């Protein structure tokens, strides 16, 4: 284990299968220099990687470290990480919330119905034993429970009262290569908000042959 880019803490590992290579000693300084770059900003639409692993099966180097130095290490691995991460069908992971919606008896009927509106869902349909005030945790792809503070009030009566909180991530693979998949199109909004190529580059341009 070498580093945990970005920042030396992100869930990205420099795994080496290199078991018969000599010059790993003087390149571990600059291998890790650009490993954190490709995980700070990404290939598809340019943000932080998460649970992305780099398994260096092998490395080929020079004799001396001159053309094996920083001028020829950062760029060359900026195309190597972009290869494997694209060869394993890069996907999307979306943060969710730790909501606990205070509610009456059947506001869950409102809540449980308005939770699964935009690909979100429910963790559990739990409740408070002491009162008919039910509490629900849910998956919400941070998109988006704008306060439905009217919708649950249209079913139950005079106690509806939504309050939510926030939690960790959540992943679902939608194959973002084509501008047809649902998560392959949400990236488009983030794309033109960056101002770069509309199309996602495939792995062919980032991966070579024999």
């Amino acid at each position: 284990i070498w580093c945990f880019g970005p920042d030396g803490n992100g869930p990205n590992l420099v795994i080496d299968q290199t078991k018969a290579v000599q010059y790993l000693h003087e390149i571990k300084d600059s291998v890790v220099a650009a490993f954190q770059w490709a995980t700070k900003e990404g290939p598809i639409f340019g943000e932080e990687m998460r649970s992305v692993r780099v398994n260096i099966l092998d490395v080929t180097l020079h004799a001396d470290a001159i053309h094996r130095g920083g001028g020829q290490i950062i760029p060359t691995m900026r195309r190597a990480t972009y290869a494997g991460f694209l060869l394993a069908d890069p996907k999307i992971q979306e943060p969710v919330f730790l909501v606990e919606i205070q509610c009456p008896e059947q506001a869950v009927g409102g809540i449980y119905s308005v939770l699964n509106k935009k690909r979100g869902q429910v963790v559990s349909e739990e409740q408070r034993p002491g009162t008919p005030l039910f509490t629900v945790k849910a998956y919400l792809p941070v998109n988006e429970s704008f306060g439905f503070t009217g919708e649950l009030r249209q079913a139950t009566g005079g106690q509806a009262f939504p309050q939510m909180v926030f939690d960790h991530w959540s992943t679902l693979g939608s194959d973002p290569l084509d501008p047809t998949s649902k998560a392959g199109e949400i990236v488009l909004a983030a794309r033109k908000r960056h101002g770069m190529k509309e199309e996602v580059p495939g792995w062919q341009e980032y991966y070579d042959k024999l």
Binding site: T18, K19, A20, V21, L24
Partner: protein
């Protein structure tokens, strides 16, 4: 030369902990109403075994414990 981790294709092997008998010595001698004691396990016939070596019982023979010989009950 760069080394590598030694792979474990089998789970760990646990060193055997001795069966700590609790006053089993009280179960090798039997006394009567007059206190007359008599050995319950046989003794090793080899000279360098002991008068109380108490050959371990088994299914179909008698193992010493110290001299590591083989005895048969019916010989």
């Amino acid at each position: 030369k760069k080394r590598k981790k030694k792979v474990y294709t089998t789970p760990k092997k646990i060193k055997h902990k001795h069966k700590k008998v609790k006053l089993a010595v009280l179960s090798y001698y039997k006394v009567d109403a007059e206190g007359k004691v008599t050995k319950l396990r046989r003794e090793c016939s080899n000279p360098t075994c002991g008068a109380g070596v108490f050959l371990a019982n088994h299914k179909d023979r008698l193992y010493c414990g110290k001299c590591h010989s083989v005895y048969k009950v019916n010989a």
